[PDB]
């Protein structure tokens, strides 16, 4: 049948960027224009593909990665970018083929005192590889003194909370991100646009 896109975009729960979610879209027909027509998206950036030609294309593997970041970090989701989110939370490949979609979610993911249940990693010994996910809770050793497993001098817990308050600036307001990854191999297709599909 049709691809489960509303399940990804309209999901009742979004993950923290450090524990970003992934869904495979497979054995389905993908109506992309219903998402590209929508005027609800602050960002719709496609790399290596065209938002229109997608409906006349077929792909071997398609992944939808979802998470929540703040506005000023949406620029980091693009390929070849640097920063805490790109280096330590969600890295895109330089050969990335797919679209990055974002929308302001202040009405859902913000509370007056602050919604602190959305986390990010600001400390890591190495940079993430493309599409790696790090959900470790180990204390980070920012200096030469070992940490002995507890937070202290130059020994930090590597996760902090976005404080999402409705009065914040848009650059500090929560943004929900969905990343469509498109992969074409010499192998059977699992997702095809409608222009290459048969519907009874």
């Amino acid at each position, epitope marked *: 049948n049709l691809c489960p896109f509303g399940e990804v975009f309209n999901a009742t729960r979004f993950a923290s960027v450090y524990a970003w979610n992934r869904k495979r879209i497979s054995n389905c027909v993908a109506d992309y224009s219903v998402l590209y027509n929508s005027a609800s998206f602050s960002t719709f950036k496609c790399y290596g593909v065209s938002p229109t030609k997608l409906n006349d294309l077929c792909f071997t593997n398609v992944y939808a990665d979802s998470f929540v970041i703040r506005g000023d970090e949406v620029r980091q989701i693009a390929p070849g970018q640097t920063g805490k989110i790109a280096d330590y939370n969600y890295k895109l490949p330089d050969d990335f083929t797919g679209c990055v979609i974002a929308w302001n979610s202040n009405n859902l993911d913000s509370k007056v005192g602050g919604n602190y249940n959305y*986390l990010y990693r600001l400390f890591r010994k190495s940079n993430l590889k493309p599409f790696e996910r*790090d959900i470790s*809770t180990e204390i980070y050793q920012a200096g030469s003194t070992p940490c002995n497993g507890v937070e202290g001098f130059n020994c930090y817990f590597p996760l902090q909370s976005y404080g999402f308050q409705p009065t914040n600036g848009v650059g500090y307001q929560p943004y929900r991100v969905v990343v469509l990854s498109f992969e074409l191999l010499h192998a059977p297709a699992t997702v095809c646009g409608p222009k290459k599909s048969t519907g009874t």
Partner: single-chain antibody
Amino acid sequence: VQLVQSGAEVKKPGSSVKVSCKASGGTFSSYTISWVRQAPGQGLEWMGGIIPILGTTNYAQKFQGRVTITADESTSTAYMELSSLRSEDTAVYYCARKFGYSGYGATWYFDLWGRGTLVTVSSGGSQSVLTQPPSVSGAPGQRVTISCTGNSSNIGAGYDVHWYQQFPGTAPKLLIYGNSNRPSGVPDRFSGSKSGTSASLAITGLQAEDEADYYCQSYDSSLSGSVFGGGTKLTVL
């Protein structure tokens, strides 16, 4: 650490129960304390958890607005309160530590468990997202396998699969973390694998002492939570 839980409680329908989980060390140091339920006809269900050092919470959609999880580093005790109790809520409620790591398909597992607190509510069915055969039989000294078949949302997405071993009268115990890795104390005869939407647990040199229930755990992004399998009773002839 060792996780010690509260005593058994008998409650009436519509009442509320609040159970406690206290750590031996007395620090709750950078740990994530999760609550996993085992209710007849509903299998193993992750309910939620908290990272005490941050105080941030995470609940399962099925129990949200009905469960409340708190932690207090002073007492080194975490609490879980279930409201509007129903007869189906009768279950062995476990407290467990939630571990993490860094790979492309990394997802949490539960390495340390408590004995479990029993809650009986006095006076339908939940189908698992991961499918296992109810029963598998094997002869001693031969190789046996158990299958776990997730949908596109979990194993198809690439999420790793972990395995838990549960003996009669005991609590679930980690057997395989990651797709193939073994905690210390697990024999080399146990092995794991993942391909496509399915995962496998292989036991070689099968012995009578391997006769137990085996579960597979993955992360389902359609539910945004950890999911367990229906369980497989291995029988050694």
